[PDB]
Amino acid sequence: SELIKENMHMKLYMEGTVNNHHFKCTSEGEGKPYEGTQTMKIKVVEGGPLPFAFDILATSFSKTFINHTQGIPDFFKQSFPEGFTWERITTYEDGGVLTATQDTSLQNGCIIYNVKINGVNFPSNGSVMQKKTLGWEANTEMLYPADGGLRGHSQMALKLVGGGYLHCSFKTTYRSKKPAKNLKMPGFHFVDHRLERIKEADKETYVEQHEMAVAKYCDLPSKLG
Amino acid sequence: SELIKENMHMKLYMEGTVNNHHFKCTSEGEGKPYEGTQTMKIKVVEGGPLPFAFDILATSFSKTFINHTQGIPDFFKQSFPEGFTWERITTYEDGGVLTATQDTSLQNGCIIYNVKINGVNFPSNGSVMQKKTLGWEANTEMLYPADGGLRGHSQMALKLVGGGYLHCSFKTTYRSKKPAKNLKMPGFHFVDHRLERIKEADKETYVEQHEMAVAKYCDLPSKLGHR
Amino acid sequence: SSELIKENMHMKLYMEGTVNNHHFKCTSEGEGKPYEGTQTMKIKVVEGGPLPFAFDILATSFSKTFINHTQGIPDFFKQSFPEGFTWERITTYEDGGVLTATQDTSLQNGCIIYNVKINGVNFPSNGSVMQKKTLGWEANTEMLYPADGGLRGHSQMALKLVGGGYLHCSFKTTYRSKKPAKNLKMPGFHFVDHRLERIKEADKETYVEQHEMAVAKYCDLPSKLG
Amino acid sequence: HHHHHHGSSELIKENMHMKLYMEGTVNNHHFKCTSEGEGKPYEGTQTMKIKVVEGGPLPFAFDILATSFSKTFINHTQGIPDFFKQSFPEGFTWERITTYEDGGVLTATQDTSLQNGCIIYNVKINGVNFPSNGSVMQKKTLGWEANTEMLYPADGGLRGHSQMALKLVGGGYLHCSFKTTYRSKKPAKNLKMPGFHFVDHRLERIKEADKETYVEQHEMAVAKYCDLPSKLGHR
Numbered sequence: 001s002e003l004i005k006e007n008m009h010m011k012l013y014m015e016g017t018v019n020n021h022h023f024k025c026t027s028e029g030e031g032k033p034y035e036g037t038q039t040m041k042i043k044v045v046e047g048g049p050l051p052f053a054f055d056i057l058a059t060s061f062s063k064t065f066i067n068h069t070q071g072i073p074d075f076f077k078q079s080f081p082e083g084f085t086w087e088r089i090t091t092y093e094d095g096g097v098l099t100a101t102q103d104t105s106l107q108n109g110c111i112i113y114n115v116k117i118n119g120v121n122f123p124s125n126g127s128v129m130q131k132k133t134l135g136w137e138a139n140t141e142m143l144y145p146a147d148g149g150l151r152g153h154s155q156m157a158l159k160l161v162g163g164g165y166l167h168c169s170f171k172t173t174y175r176s177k178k179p180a181k182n183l184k185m186p187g188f189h190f191v192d193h194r195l196e197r198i199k200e201a202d203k204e205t206y207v208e209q210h211e212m213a214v215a216k217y218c219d220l221p222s223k224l225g
Numbered sequence: 226s227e228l229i230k231e232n233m234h235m236k237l238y239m240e241g242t243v244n245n246h247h248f249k250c251t252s253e254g255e256g257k258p259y260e261g262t263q264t265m266k267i268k269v270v271e272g273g274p275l276p277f278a279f280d281i282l283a284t285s286f287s288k289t290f291i292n293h294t295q296g297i298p299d300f301f302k303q304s305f306p307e308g309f310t311w312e313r314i315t316t317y318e319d320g321g322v323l324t325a326t327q328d329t330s331l332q333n334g335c336i337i338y339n340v341k342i343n344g345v346n347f348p349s350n351g352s353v354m355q356k357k358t359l360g361w362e363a364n365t366e367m368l369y370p371a372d373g374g375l376r377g378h379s380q381m382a383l384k385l386v387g388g389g390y391l392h393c394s395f396k397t398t399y400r401s402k403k404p405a406k407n408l409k410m411p412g413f414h415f416v417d418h419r420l421e422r423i424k425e426a427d428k429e430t431y432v433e434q435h436e437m438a439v440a441k442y443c444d445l446p447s448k449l450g451h452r
Numbered sequence: 453s454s455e456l457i458k459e460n461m462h463m464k465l466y467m468e469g470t471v472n473n474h475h476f477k478c479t480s481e482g483e484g485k486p487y488e489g490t491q492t493m494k495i496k497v498v499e500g501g502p503l504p505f506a507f508d509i510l511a512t513s514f515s516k517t518f519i520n521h522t523q524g525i526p527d528f529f530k531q532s533f534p535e536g537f538t539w540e541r542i543t544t545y546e547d548g549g550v551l552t553a554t555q556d557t558s559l560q561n562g563c564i565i566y567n568v569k570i571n572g573v574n575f576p577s578n579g580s581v582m583q584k585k586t587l588g589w590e591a592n593t594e595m596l597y598p599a600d601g602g603l604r605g606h607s608q609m610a611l612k613l614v615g616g617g618y619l620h621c622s623f624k625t626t627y628r629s630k631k632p633a634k635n636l637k638m639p640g641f642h643f644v645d646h647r648l649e650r651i652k653e654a655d656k657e658t659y660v661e662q663h664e665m666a667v668a669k670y671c672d673l674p675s676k677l678g
Numbered sequence: 679h680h681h682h683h684h685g686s687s688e689l690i691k692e693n694m695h696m697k698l699y700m701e702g703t704v705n706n707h708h709f710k711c712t713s714e715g716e717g718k719p720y721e722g723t724q725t726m727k728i729k730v731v732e733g734g735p736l737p738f739a740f741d742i743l744a745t746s747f748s749k750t751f752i753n754h755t756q757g758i759p760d761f762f763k764q765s766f767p768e769g770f771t772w773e774r775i776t777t778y779e780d781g782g783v784l785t786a787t788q789d790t791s792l793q794n795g796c797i798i799y800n801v802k803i804n805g806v807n808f809p810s811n812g813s814v815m816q817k818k819t820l821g822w823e824a825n826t827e828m829l830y831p832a833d834g835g836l837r838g839h840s841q842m843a844l845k846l847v848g849g850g851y852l853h854c855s856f857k858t859t860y861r862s863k864k865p866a867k868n869l870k871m872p873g874f875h876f877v878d879h880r881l882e883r884i885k886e887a888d889k890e891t892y893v894e895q896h897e898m899a900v901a902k903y904c905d906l907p908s909k910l911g912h913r
Contacts, residue, residue, distance in 0.1 A: 017326045017341060020310040020400055030837050085245045087345035089322045095546060097314045099343040101242045101326040116242060117326040118343035120312035121398050124372045136903035137874050140826040142841055144851055147349040153841045155828055165830055167839060173346050177244055194906040212906045218824035220880040220898045245453035297481045318781060320498040362641050365593040367608055371619050380595055382641060390597055413590050413610060419673040439675045442593035445665045470787045470802060472863060473771040501689040538706040540806035542783045550775045552804040554703045570705060571785040571804035573773035574859050576835040600810045626807050628706060
């Protein structure tokens with residue numbers, strides 16, 4: 001994947017609505033695609049300060065930055081120069097849902113993200129609308145081919161002020177802009193993620209996030225096969 | 226609201242994405258707000274023809290047109306001149322999800338809708354993407370106050386070619402732009418809907434829809450004297 | 453059309469189950485008017501009482517023969533006798549609890565007989581159900597059509613809470629006849645309006661009387677199409 | 679510091695046997711199963727030999743019952759407290775609902791006890807709405823992939839969240855997820871609760887006979903924290 005260098009920059013545009021609060025964000029980032037690490041610096045540029053926890057947006061800000069181990073084919077790095085899209089719905093156990101659609105392209109050496117967010121039904125006294133959340137635990141995504149692309153299933157735990165967790169889960173479809181004939185698809189595998197907030201300011205209108213992500217098989221040996 | 230006359234027109238703009246496919250629609254319509262009937266004439270103006278059944282968009286194109294029976298307060302008509310919003314997620318039994326957020330306003334005597342659609346994960350070879358659908362049956366929405374607005378719960382049956390159905394359900398929150406103290410909130414009630422397609426052309430890039438909607442209580446007697 | 457189902461019928465029920473990991477058994481006796489769609493059941497918790505959860509979560513598990521089928525809608529349940537029928541259902545509450553139930557309905561010496569198994573899980577420890585903050589169900593409208601070799605129902609119900617709020621639940625049911633499909637006239641798409649009410653209680657909900665009225669009908673609104 | 683290996687759960691030996699009784703219904707098909715097994719509780723490995731003793735042959739894929747047949751056999755690494763092994767002699771329960779993407783649901787409740795040195799399981803199954811033409815009722819499934827369960831305290835016990843992939847005849851997968859609550863019969867004051875952590879599982883069918891009325895299953899299960907470093911110093 002020669003177009004994806006050891007170090008890459010990214011730029012992002014996001015617009016969305018959560019319940020009926022409209023906003024726009026931009027971000028600039030850098031990372032090491034083959035090491036599976038990256039940092040994004042994010043600005044809320046319209047609609048700030050947001051009345052909901054920024055944590056619900058965190059997964060919507062970068063699939064080229066996954067260290068693919070154990071010979072697992074890399075759906076995302078193979079997709080350049082054409083790029084790829086993703087689409088996702090996250091459901092929170094207390095009723096809120098966050099839907100996101102995303103385009104990833106490569107333009108003059110910079111990876112470009114365009115994201116649309118539609119979140120609905122977040123409960124008025126829930127931790128998200130009360131801004132009583134404290135970031136995500138690590139998680140393991142489970143992936144396999146489906147629907148002409150790559151399906152992901154994830155489950156994440158959101159830390160709460162006062163202790164304990166709010167659960168969510170999401171279903172993602174990643175779609176390449178290359179035709180299947182020109183891709184080596186992975187089989188069933190996992191991606192371990194640790195998505196962290198490293199800095200913030202001004203009531204979450206400035207946020208820095210770091211992610212480490214590694215594609216791998218399960219640690220445990222198989223009796224069969 | 227006296228601002229809502231016995232006959233009203235509406236205009237709509239919509240933009241969205243379904244499974245990576247971007248599109249825009251506009252529409253014009255007319256209806257009888259107190260009688261609960263309306264017709265909208267819809268154009269796909271960008272991104273057409275759509276690669277999915279237009280039926281999944283039908284509920285996203287009008288809450289001021291509900292006949293409120295039995296004295297049930299009308300959350301929507303009371304909200305003018307300020308207007309109201311709605312937000313919704315529809316989940317289909319085969320994996321698709323259709324999220325929508327909407328703004329309703331009143332401008333120069335015309336009701337104005339602005340809608341954003343985000344649909345994801347519709348199965349690639351399923352009924353929606355293969356255009357095997359034939360419109361909706363009637364349904365009964367269940368409503369009550371929640372979350373600082375009015376909560377709706379709906380379950381609908383989409384007719385399929387060959388005679389079956391595809392199930393979906395949705396959860397809606399309707400929010401007024403008037404403060405709660407200036408509204409008479411309804412209690413628990415139902416709205417019966419019949420949302421029908423009455424014309425189409427050009428691979429569903431022109432569609433006409435009619436809806437009738439009537440708010441009511443359950444008319445079965447109650448041993449406990451409840452509505 | 454269904455000679456075995458008389459204007460007045462009696463019922464007897466046995467139920468065993470677990471909610472979270474609390475085991476219990478119930479019995480009940482009832483009577484109703486199958487063609488008028490009304491019935492009353494008098495229910496006893498006979499093992500495992502008092503229950504640590506609101507009895508409201510069990511209400512829908514205690515009677516499909518008692519629905520007034522209007523407008524010519526075929527009656528899947530009354531037609532199923534003498535062989536009888538079964539139902540299976542999962543109810544999901546918005547705060548995480550789930551209540552699964554499977555039921556057998558038979559007719560024995562002129563009495564309708566119910567055998568029910570309940571498995572409820574993950575009800576939140578400090579939630580409305582375990583803290584007994586519930587006040588019975590609102591009315592509701594079930595939506596039905598054939599599927600999976602039987603009759604599919606979809607329901608959504610609102611549980612009243614102390615203080616005036618609601619807890620939502622929904623459920624999916626499959627009703628299955630013990631008659632072969634060839635010997636049944638299947639209904640098409642239709643609704644059943646229900647009003648399920650508690651009329652008496654004693655002894656920390658270890659004695660409960662419930663009444664239900666149920667009516668099968670089409671939507672009242674006219675169609676432009678068809 | 680305890681003086682002896684495994685001093686924090688002495689009734690659980692390095693080798694243990696188990697016996698199980700199960701009864702249930704799927705759609706409205708009633709059945710009963712029994713099983714006997716053995717495993718190495720601290721190593722996280724075990725094998726169960728299962729018989730369908732009433733209601734066989736089953737008209738649905740046995741794969742949907744696989745997770746209902748053993749929490750004492752998890753290798754807890756990295757010092758993670760072992761909720762299950764700590765719970766003896768009193769034992770523990772679990773309760774779970776599994777939702778399949780094509781509409782079927784499999785609910786299960788379970789009691790675990792220790793009787794004369796043998797671990798005893800009593801399980802109740804209630805499965806509903808499995809679609810008539812789905813892979814489960816058509817018996818077109820081919821066992822589970824590995825998975826990673828996510829766990830943390832909640833509801834006075836230990837919450838688990840799981841997502842699994844069921845291999846299908848012809849290729850591809852059917853998705854399910856489940857939510858579990860594990861509950862100790864010891865009071866909270868006598869337990870050292872773990873924090874947030876993961877359990878990797880690989881649940882495999884190693885033998886079957888007579889239209890799935892005899893099945894042998896092996897499982898390996900290992901509790902761990904996420905491997906990856908944390909910029910914030912978290913586990």
